[PDB]
Amino acid sequence: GPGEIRPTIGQQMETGDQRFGDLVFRQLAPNVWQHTSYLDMPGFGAVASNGLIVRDGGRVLVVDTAWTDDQTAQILNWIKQEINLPVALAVVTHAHQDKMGGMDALHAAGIATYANALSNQLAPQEGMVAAQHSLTFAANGWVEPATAPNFGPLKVFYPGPGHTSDNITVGIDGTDIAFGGCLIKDSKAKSLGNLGDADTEHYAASARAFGAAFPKASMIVMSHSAPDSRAAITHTARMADKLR
């Protein structure tokens, strides 16, 4: 492949990843893949956003869309061509473009979409389309089971306000993988990204709440970095400690 996608922020390509259209796919587990799409900024470079694809028996579950509807449609085509299994549902982590930019692609494909109820409420103001179903959460952050039917190994957890007020996280039961979304940055991150809609008071405790909810997860997946160790949880929690 003469000429590969090398973004300015986000992980770089390496053999073991599979370039598919404008996107990059990396297998993290026998049944878990990471999908990476790129937002080409006008004179700034590609901005990578990561999600996850999970095979649960005869169906496939998706975590987070791509930046655009087109890149999200390419994800579904990669699923049909490489896994050849229907997508049962998708769950998006919060109401920003890198997570809900491709809702129209999922809804055109007939896939049931789930999000935090606050995400569906904030999606109008963020220029996003809400998900079809709303997730609600208990007082300790765990999702109400009645609102997440047939989620399989997807264990959804709301850690509290951090990167946004509505950011949620997803642990993959039966694996050692947990997804932190835009709430967690890698262990060598220089900052905590876009603090525009961030909760600077509760960010630190929300990072640890995510780590305490999945204490056995050794691989942590985030939006704009290669999968890291639990030191990613630690680094951003102490980075957010400086926001006092």
Ligand X SMILES: CC1(C)S[C@H]([C@H](NC(=O)[C@H](N)c2ccccc2)C(=O)O)N[C@H]1C(=O)O
Interface ranges with Zn ion (CB under 5 A): 96, 98, 182, 223
Q: With the C-alpha atoms ordered 156, 181, 87, 65, is the resulting torsion angle positive or negative?
A: positive
Any idea which residue has 């990204």 for tokens?
193
Q: Which residues bind ligand X (CB under 6 A)?
A: 47, 96-98, 126-127, 163, 182, 193-194, 223-224
The distance of closest approach from Cβ of residue 58 to ligand X in the complex, given in angstroms and rounded to an integer, is 32
The distance of closest approach from Cβ of residue 8 to Zn ion in the complex, given in angstroms and rounded to an integer, is 14
Q: Give 39's strand partners.
A: 47
| Residue 97 binding: pick among ligand X, a copy of itself, Zn ion, none (C-beta 5-8 Å cut-off by kind) | ligand X
Provide the token pair at 56: 């649960």
Residue nearer to a copy of itself on the CB measure, 10 or 161: 161
Residue 35 labeled ligand binder: no
CA 233 – CA 13 distance, rounded (Å): 23
| Residue 73 binding: pick among ligand X, a copy of itself, Zn ion, none (C-beta 5-8 Å cut-off by kind) | none
Q: Which residues bind a copy of itself (CB under 8 A)?
A: 117-118, 120-122, 125, 130, 134, 136-141, 144, 158, 160-161, 165, 196-197, 199, 201-202, 205
Residue 182 labeled ligand binder: yes
Residue 216 labeled ligand binder: no
Tallying the residues shown for the chain, one arrives at 244
CA 70 – CA 196 distance, rounded (Å): 26
- Angle value at C-alpha 95, between 239 and 25, nearest 5 degrees: 80
Residue 77 labeled ligand binder: no
Give, rounded to a whole angstrom, the gap between the first and last alpha carbons of the chain. 47
Residue nearer to ligand X on the CB measure, 45 or 152: 45
Residue 150 labeled ligand binder: no
The distance of closest approach from Cβ of residue 146 to a copy of itself in the complex, given in angstroms and rounded to an integer, is 9
Question: Is beta strand 219-222 parallel, antiparallel or unpaired with respect to 177-181?
Answer: parallel
Burial class (CB in 10 A: 0-12, 13-18, 19+), 103: buried
From the annotation, which residues make up the binding site for substrate? 185, 194
